[PDB]
Amino acid sequence: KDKVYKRPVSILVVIYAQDTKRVLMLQRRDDPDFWQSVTGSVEEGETAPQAAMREVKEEVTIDVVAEQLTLIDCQRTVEFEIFSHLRHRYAPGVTRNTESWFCLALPHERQIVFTEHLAYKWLDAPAAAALTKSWSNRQAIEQFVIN
Ligand code: NA
Ligand SMILES: [Sm+3]
């Protein structure tokens, strides 16, 4: 029919490489100035962990299950004003988003087959955190990568 609305309940997955401690920063198609980790709405009839896994498979082609990896519940939920210029993707009146964090450590840096984004960079955590426009994404990387 149309582009049905994004649900204001979403997940964030902080991917980083264990060996280098570099962070995967993907570049958004709708705001090419916005660099971020993996995000996505938590669909109707699935949990946040299942959403995290589903988002990582879609956005960056990595099967957590197939590659036997550990999807850590980073155990933070924050709430923020959605960026003015992206609000339109949400049902009328919706201005705030609820976001739960997950961190995922890959054994090495790799080539990424991104499907929805323009590009990826592997950055050092401080550089990553300064880059993103998302204050939560920024905090997630500070708390759980820079440590
Ligand atoms: Na997404
Ligand atoms: Sm997605």
- Residue ranges of domains in the chain, CATH in brackets: 1-147 (3.90.79.10)
Distances (CA, A) of 33 to 16, 85, 105, 132: 21, 12, 25, 9
| Distance from residue 20's CA to the centre of ligand 1 (Å) | 25
CA–CA separation, 84 and 88 (whole Å)? 8
Give the C-alpha separation, 52 to 95, whole Å: 23
Asked if residue 39 belongs to a known ligand binding site, the reply is: yes
Query: Residue 30's closest CA among 85, 84, 99?
Result: 85
Cα of 50 from ligand 1 centre, angstroms: 14
What backbone torsions phi and psi does residue 89 show, to the nearest 5 degrees?
A: -80, 0
Residues 34 and 136 sit within 8 Å (Cβ to Cβ): no
| Residue 144 · residue 74 · CB < 8 Å | yes
Determined by: X-ray
Those residues whose beta carbon sits under 5 angstroms from the ion ligand 2 are: 40, 58
Query: Looking up tokens 């955190």, which residue turns up?
Result: 129
HSE value, Cβ hemisphere, 13 Å, CA-based, for 71 = 24
Expressed in angstroms and rounded, the spacing between residue 136 Cα and the centre of ligand 2 is: 18
Identify which ligand lies nearest to the alpha carbon of 28: 1
Is 134 part of any known ligand binding site? yes
If phi over 0 gives left and psi between -120 and 50 gives alpha, with beta otherwise, what is residue 11?
A: beta
Q: Residue 85 is which amino acid?
A: H
Neighbours of 28 (CB within 10 A): 17
Structural contact between residues 102 and 52, judged by C-beta atoms closer than 8 angstroms:
yes
| Closest ligand to the CA of 13 | 1
Helix, strand or coil, per DSSP, at residue 142: helix
Report whether 6 belongs to an annotated binding site.
Answer: yes
Distance 140 CA to ligand 1 centre (A): 17
Measured torsion, CA atoms of residues 92, 7, 128, 59, in degrees rounded to the nearest 10: -130
The rounded Cα 64 to chain-centroid distance in angstroms is: 15
